[model samples]
Target: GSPLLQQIHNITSFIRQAKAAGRMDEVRTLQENLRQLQDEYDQQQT
Candidate 1:
């Protein structure tokens, strides 16, 4: 499994928690990071 995939999963969990806690700032940051990770993961698939 890709490390980026693990990171994406972890960040997704964090984003879920942050959303529940009303932490928009943290959520936004995590989402941005998640996007980057997804991009890398996609590249690796090519």
Candidate 2:
């Protein structure tokens, strides 16, 4: 479901599913990825 890297429905929904599935470790990494993406996107903005 990844390597496509969580793009099925976006990070918020993906995180919710991971939380429901009790995959906190996966959530942690995904959260980190979300943060990194936010930073990059922010930087890329004017």
Candidate 3:
């Protein structure tokens, strides 16, 4: 969990840049990755 959190933090800027650039596809992909990671994290929390 800690490592994954770090990884998420690391790539967050790229996601921001993708959004700022108005790249819908890139944003969608990044969003999906974030969602899945969060889902997995939630499952682990339970």
Candidate 4:
């Protein structure tokens, strides 16, 4: 995976932890960040 992919993985990890800790607000922002990273990753496939 590319560096961007690695970053996505890290963010996903954080989201999981945040959810377990009841940090829904942080999870929401992390999810948004995840979405943007996924968009970039998809663009790289073209």
lDDT of 1 at 22: 100
Q: Write the per-residue lDDT of candidate 3 for residues 1-35, one digit (tens) a residue.
A: 88777767756777999988999899888887887
The TM-score values for the models, in the order shown, are 0.91, 0.68, 0.75, 0.92
Model with the higher lDDT, candidate 1 or 3: 1
Give residue 12's error in model 3 in angstroms: 3.0
Name model 3 segments beyond 4 Å from true: none
Per-residue accuracy of model 1 over 1-46 as CA lDDT, tens digit each: 4778888899999999999999999999889999988988998897
Point out the higher-scoring one by TM-score: 1 or 3: 1
Which lDDT values do the candidates have, in the order given?
0.90, 0.73, 0.79, 0.94
Write the residue-wise lDDT of candidate 2 on 1-46 in tens digits. Answer: 2323344238868889999999999999989888877666556563
Error of 4 at 11 (Å): 0.4
TM-score attained by model 1: 0.91
Q: Which residue pairs clash within candidate 1? A: none
Q: Ten-residue segment with the worst summed lDDT in candidate 2?
A: 1-10
> Which digits, one per residue and each the tens of the lDDT, describe model 4 over residues 1-46?
4999999999999999999999989999999999999999999886
Predicted model with the maximum lDDT:
4
| Residues forming the 10-long window of minimal summed lDDT in candidate 3 | 4-13
**Residue 1, candidate 3: how far off, in angstroms?**
1.2
**Residue-pair clashes per candidate:** 0, 0, 0, 0
* Global Cα lDDT for candidate 1: 0.90
Q: What local lDDT does model 4 show for residue 12?
A: 92
